[PDB]
Design an enzyme around this catalytic site. Structure first.
Site, PDB file in Angstrom:
ATOM      1  N   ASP A  47      -7.643  -2.070   0.127  1.00  0.00           N
ATOM      2  CA  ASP A  47      -6.550  -2.916   0.436  1.00  0.00           C
ATOM      3  C   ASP A  47      -7.211  -4.297   1.050  1.00  0.00           C
ATOM      4  OD1 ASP A  47      -4.476  -4.432   2.582  1.00  0.00           O
ATOM      5  OD2 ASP A  47      -3.562  -2.241   2.465  1.00  0.00           O
TER       6      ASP A  47
ATOM      7  N   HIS B   1       0.667  -1.059  -0.082  1.00  0.00           N
ATOM      8  CA  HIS B   1       0.090   0.029  -0.145  1.00  0.00           C
ATOM      9  C   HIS B   1       0.818   1.438  -0.006  1.00  0.00           C
ATOM     10  CE1 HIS B   1      -4.459   0.795   0.865  1.00  0.00           C
ATOM     11  NE2 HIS B   1      -4.256   1.430   0.014  1.00  0.00           N
TER      12      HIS B   1
ATOM     13  N   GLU C 263      -2.062  -5.111  -1.516  1.00  0.00           N
ATOM     14  CA  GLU C 263      -1.555  -6.120  -0.563  1.00  0.00           C
ATOM     15  C   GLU C 263      -1.947  -7.643  -0.865  1.00  0.00           C
ATOM     16  OE1 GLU C 263       0.619  -5.477   1.665  1.00  0.00           O
ATOM     17  OE2 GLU C 263       0.516  -3.125   1.953  1.00  0.00           O
TER      18      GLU C 263
ATOM     19  N   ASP D  29      -9.489  -0.280   4.407  1.00  0.00           N
ATOM     20  CA  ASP D  29      -8.211  -0.803   5.159  1.00  0.00           C
ATOM     21  C   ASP D  29      -8.557  -1.050   6.354  1.00  0.00           C
ATOM     22  OD1 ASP D  29      -5.273  -1.450   5.844  1.00  0.00           O
ATOM     23  OD2 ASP D  29      -4.874  -0.037   4.312  1.00  0.00           O
TER      24      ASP D  29
ATOM     25  N   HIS E  71      -6.192  -0.807   8.695  1.00  0.00           N
ATOM     26  CA  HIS E  71      -5.331   0.320   9.018  1.00  0.00           C
ATOM     27  C   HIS E  71      -5.507   1.820   8.241  1.00  0.00           C
ATOM     28  CE1 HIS E  71      -3.600  -3.650   9.000  1.00  0.00           C
ATOM     29  NE2 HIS E  71      -3.039  -3.518   9.982  1.00  0.00           N
TER      30      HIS E  71
ATOM     31  N   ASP F 264      -2.857   3.724   7.880  1.00  0.00           N
ATOM     32  CA  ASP F 264      -1.698   4.060   7.211  1.00  0.00           C
ATOM     33  C   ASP F 264      -1.352   5.469   7.051  1.00  0.00           C
ATOM     34  OD1 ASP F 264      -1.763   1.128   6.630  1.00  0.00           O
ATOM     35  OD2 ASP F 264      -2.606   1.362   4.671  1.00  0.00           O
TER      36      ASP F 264
ATOM     37  N   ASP G 255      -6.631  -6.387   3.275  1.00  0.00           N
ATOM     38  CA  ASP G 255      -6.700  -6.716   4.622  1.00  0.00           C
ATOM     39  C   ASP G 255      -8.106  -5.860   5.180  1.00  0.00           C
ATOM     40  OD1 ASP G 255      -3.858  -4.748   6.118  1.00  0.00           O
ATOM     41  OD2 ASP G 255      -6.034  -4.111   5.348  1.00  0.00           O
TER      42      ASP G 255
ATOM     43  N   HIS H  96       4.447   1.316   4.058  1.00  0.00           N
ATOM     44  CA  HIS H  96       3.144   0.900   3.622  1.00  0.00           C
ATOM     45  C   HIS H  96       2.008   1.463   4.611  1.00  0.00           C
ATOM     46  CE1 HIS H  96       2.125  -3.336   5.383  1.00  0.00           C
ATOM     47  NE2 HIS H  96       3.154  -2.594   5.991  1.00  0.00           N
TER      48      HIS H  96
END
Lengths: 314, 314, 314
Positions: free
Chosen positions: A227, A96, A272, A119, A121, A123, A229, A136
């Protein structure tokens, strides 16, 4: 919808290397073909040839800065080109950190874009708040105007110029945010829907509010940085930073199906996907097949069905 | 939030013995540490030393009455002590029969408490309506004032005095209720949200209504008796009485995250974690790790993130 | 509720044969008994003896037309009989092509019925729009009045007479619809709730609207054609045409629990259970046990619990 495919085989934004196989496995799963099987005009711009920067030692805690900074710089130019050709940029990525280049190149041609970040997260760590040093987990910090004069001159990123304001982005799926990151969210007043808000409101209302938040004032190009995840690891296990309690397959498709329907999607990132991390071959195909499904919904595939403007009963 | 940890290694409320390892596995998973890693003031009062009552034959159908009755009596005193020290009681339990002692000891110091029971069962069978005789399925019957004069003098429970009224409790997650139990729910007018109501309203509205129901009149201490089998066995498999179609990980965290935010949590029970029942080592860690996550959310861990009252950007 | 059980061991509506074991495995799982264990009056009419039609070559692309057409004709008569005896028809089926006979026989006695179709597919392809030729994906096309003069005289179906109008049916769970099918949905204005609508509204609102749509005008008998593939294959894996992102166990039970409560259920179909397709013995029992649970909810089993009109506290 007309797409411009860009393969971004890069991984230096984090530890595990297998993420650079992302563009490979996705294409192999038949992504180009399936998009074509849909009313899509597809032009493959190939996989960017990222060169090895042998001399790339840490900048303070930040790892592989020059390598990551160069890859996004290269990606930025490609995205700007595809956008200049009136095509929706579809960045099949590695890690990412490439969002820095994707959102940046997109903004050169469409300075008024709104970003949707799916995501687990945020980031949004700064080179000075990050604890791992992996880039990332810092992409958003480089892109925000309000954080300008808060990011150190990191080797390889001098070409960067913050393009989006705190009010031009929405997070969806958050469930693993650092303290510094949280402080930034609240201080800049960034709009987000963590897993707690999704549970409270339902993905439907979350999307209603998200689209209202970014398009209420006026219509503007939409950049979706997805993403894998962000979805629960029961759906996308082959990823480097999985966090339990994620978005479901359905919620994933709902999000993208709603974005598509706005007719304003302008840039998409599918990041990712790391095959090398699937505990089994099936976990790899489960991750890849889900990634493909999300991508297809972005360009029109509807669960209710699709039909051409013809008389099927004749 | 300031907690007072109480280990309650007891299992005689039901057949399978491994439940007495609950306090052990939970602590081993790093519960104390993780709570401390949060803005928590933690005092471990240890694991209660439950002695063996060799002479404890069935009272009619009721099994291990003296053993169960003594353990709750002992637990009641410990909870009252921790509550007298201005600390939220955190009972890491064995079987749910210990709720008799936990809620009772809590009520001595805070007679106006409201109870939230997250379980797949109501555990409100009377010594005369139960079919199994296991006391972990009868705890609520001993605590209700309206059921006083409906419960037989069971050996080992003479110290008990019903402390909560039918209107002072809310059930969440119900999906396996006996006929007698159902009749009691409807006759006393107990407020509940079975899995059917969660599906209809969403966990968000369920919590809005639950908190409104117990706090509308006025603010009052909240006792949360959490049974790990309230969540679906795909999340908490290592438990003795699992029932399919349960609450999800997210719903589990949503519930506790909302309770925390009331600032009124006064007593918490984390029950029925039985390592000995995991089909695999991973099923044990999945059950324990989920139990820990629910516990952490009870004391502030938010999925959106947490940050101290400092300037992270400095 | 009083039921009339009909075993329909048929599979020629599709390729895989194991679907004819459906009535067997369901009964073996204790379906009759469990229904009886509930306040149910149950009469087993047995498994229909479907004979082999050796001479049954394809009609154009349509496979096993005479075989499929005869089985539904035979089923239609049985359903009409059970309905004439004031009993809710419970068709334990093989493939979904049998819906032609089930809904048709039901409509002979109750011409004003409303249909609820829970499936991942619409099964509304015409003998001329189908691509596979399998008749289990064409049942609805034969039953719709508006499609009359759009279906070819298929050998074995001359006994058919379209009984339901486009406005008399509702789909729930759609996620794999062909272009022709989609065109038919939109052209005839059929009401549906694909997985996209379930995600947007929640299963609660979906059922509120579904029941309002069919019962608003006036009360009418309800026919529920349940295909086990409407639920996600994580719940019902042993089925021939599984599609990811399906309805959950809870949503499955919610749907049926709501239908039961209308007191208007008149005909039920439990289709596509194919034991021979479970990757493991557990996948077979998971599929069968879920099928049974949905069936039980159709006739009163409530997750909140059930109790007789007696005083359980005495």
């Amino acid at each position: 919808r007309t797409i411009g495919i860009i393969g971004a085989p890069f991984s230096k934004g984090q530890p595990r290397g297998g993420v650079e196989e992302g563009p490979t496995v996705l294409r192999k799963a038949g992504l180009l073909e399936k998009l074509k099987e849909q009313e899509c005009d597809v032009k493959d711009y190939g996989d960017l040839p990222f060169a090895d920067i042998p001399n790339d030692s840490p900048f303070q805690i930040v790892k592989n800065p020059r390598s990551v900074g160069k890859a996004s710089e290269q990606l930025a130019g490609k995205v700007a080109e595809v956008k200049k050709n009136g095509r929706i940029s579809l960045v099949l990525g590695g890690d990412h950190s490439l969002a820095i280049g994707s959102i940046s190149g997109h903004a050169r041609v469409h300075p008024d874009l709104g970003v949707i970040w799916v995501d687990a997260h945020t980031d949004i760590n700064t080179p000075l708040t990050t604890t791992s040093g992996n880039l990332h987990g810092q992409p958003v910090s480089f892109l925000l105007k309000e954080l300008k004069g808060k990011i150190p001159d990191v080797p390889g990123f001098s070409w960067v110029t913050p393009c989006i304001s705190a009010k031009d982005i929405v997070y969806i799926g958050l469930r693993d945010v650092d303290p510094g990151e949280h402080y930034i969210l609240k201080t800049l007043g960034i709009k987000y829907f963590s897993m707690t808000e999704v549970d409270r409101l339902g993905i439907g209302k979350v999307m209603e509010e998200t689209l209202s938040y970014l398009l209420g004032r006026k219509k503007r190009p939409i950049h979706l940085s997805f993403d894998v995840d962000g979805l629960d690891p029961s759906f996308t296990p082959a990823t480097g930073t999985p966090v339990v309690g994620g978005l479901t397959y359905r919620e994933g498709l709902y999000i993208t199906e709603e974005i598509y329907k706005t007719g304003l999607l302008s840039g998409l990132d599918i990041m990712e996907v790391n095959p090398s991390l699937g505990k089994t071959p099936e976990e790899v195909t489960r991750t890849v097949n889900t990634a493909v499904a999300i991508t297809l919904a972005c360009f029109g595939l509807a669960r209710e069905g699709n039909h051409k403007p013809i008389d099927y009963l004749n």
